[PDB]
Amino acid sequence: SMADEATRRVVSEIPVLKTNAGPRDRELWVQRLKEEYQSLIRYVENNKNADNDWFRLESNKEGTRWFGKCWYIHDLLKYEFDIEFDIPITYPTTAPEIAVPELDGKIAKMYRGGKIELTDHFKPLWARNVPKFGLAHLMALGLGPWLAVEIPDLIQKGVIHHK
């Protein structure tokens, strides 16, 4: 399957997650957050080694709200966007909705409040892998390829400018 090989090529060096727990699940949620942090930091370290260090993320104390920054390089200019998301109660079976609030209204593949609209292939891809994928995979398989389509379009249309 081309889809199976493309998924493996993108995520094969990201630690797989294990625990089926969401924000209400107490010691099981603390364990799930250990998996999420170990997977995120390995992905960041890999990204630095590949000259593609393209985001930072932090969470609140309980790990229910995430926020940070992503960067997108176009014609050697670096564009920075603030990102944020809440962890759904039914995570990790349900995928979180990444928002890029400063781009709200400016992109057709986007919902009100700046929540990105991914392709219809993303949801069944996440579903088939539960609970192995986490936030590192959402970034690698969801936001990353969305930016590589939507940011070049906004720059070429003159809707955003370099700051």
CATH of the domain at 31: 3.10.110.10
Closest CA to 36 of 124, 141, 138, 118: 138
Number of domains into which the chain is organized: 1
Tell the residue number behind the tokens 């930016």, with chain if given: 147
Burial track 24-36 (b if 16+ CB lie within 10 A, e otherwise)? eeeeebeebbebb
Does residue 64 belong to any structural domain of this protein? yes
Does residue 131 belong to any structural domain of this protein? yes
Quickly list H helices, the chain: 2-11, 27-49, 122-129, 135-138, 144-156
Does residue 163 belong to any structural domain of this protein? no
Does residue 161 belong to any structural domain of this protein? no
Q: Give the residue numbers spanning the domain of 125.
A: 2-156
CB-based contacts of 9, cutoff 8 Å, min separation 6: none
Solved using: X-ray
Is the sign of the CA dihedral 22, 26, 28, 29 positive or negative? Answer: positive
Does residue 10 belong to any structural domain of this protein? yes
φ and ψ of 101, to 5 deg? -60, -30
User: Distance between CA 131 and CA 138 in Å, rounded?
Assistant: 12
